[PDB]
Amino acid sequence: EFILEQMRLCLAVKDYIRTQIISKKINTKFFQEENTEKLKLKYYNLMIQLDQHEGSYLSICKHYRAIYDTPCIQAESEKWQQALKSVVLYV
């Protein structure tokens, strides 16, 4: 959480290179989300915001596919609909 916090601050300053540099320090620390889900959602949402800046179109698709996490996300279908629609829209 501490290392994820300043990423949004660096986005706010609009210095994308430093955000991308500090982003690589979390991805390798996977398989710890057995009891946390908010962290994963925010973690993926930051890259959703970042990647669609310049021209990226596959990475945003990968993230929206990654919104397939713990069933706590798909048990409220009213927004699971657009969650599964945005991916096929970006494909």
Question: What brief labels describe this structure?
Answer:
1 chains; 91 residues; 64% helix; 26S proteasome non-ATPase regulatory subunit 12; cytosolic protein; protein degradation
Structure, briefly:
This is 26S proteasome non-ATPase regulatory subunit 12. 64% of the residues lie in helices and 0% in strands.
How would you characterize this protein structure?
The termini are far apart. 64% of the residues lie in helices and 0% in strands. The protein has five helices and no strands. Helix 3 runs antiparallel to helix 4 and helix 4 packs antiparallel against helix 5. It has 91 residues and is mostly helical. It comes from Homo sapiens (Human). This is 26S proteasome non-ATPase regulatory subunit 12. Belongs to the proteasome subunit p55 family. The PDB classes it as cytosolic protein. Keywords: protein degradation, macromolecular complex, ubiquitin-proteasome system, cytosolic protein.
Radius of gyration: 14 Å
Q: What's the tally of helices?
A: 5
Order of helices and strands: HHHHH
**Terminal residue distance:** 31 Å
How much β-strand is present in the residues? under 5%
Instruction: Count the E strands.
Output: 0
SS content category: mainly alpha
Residues in helix, %:
55-70%
The major pleated sheet works out as: none
User: Which shape, going by the Cα principal axes?
Assistant: globular
Family: Belongs to the proteasome subunit p55 family.
Protein name: 26S proteasome non-ATPase regulatory subunit 12
Modified residues (N6-acetyllysine): 38
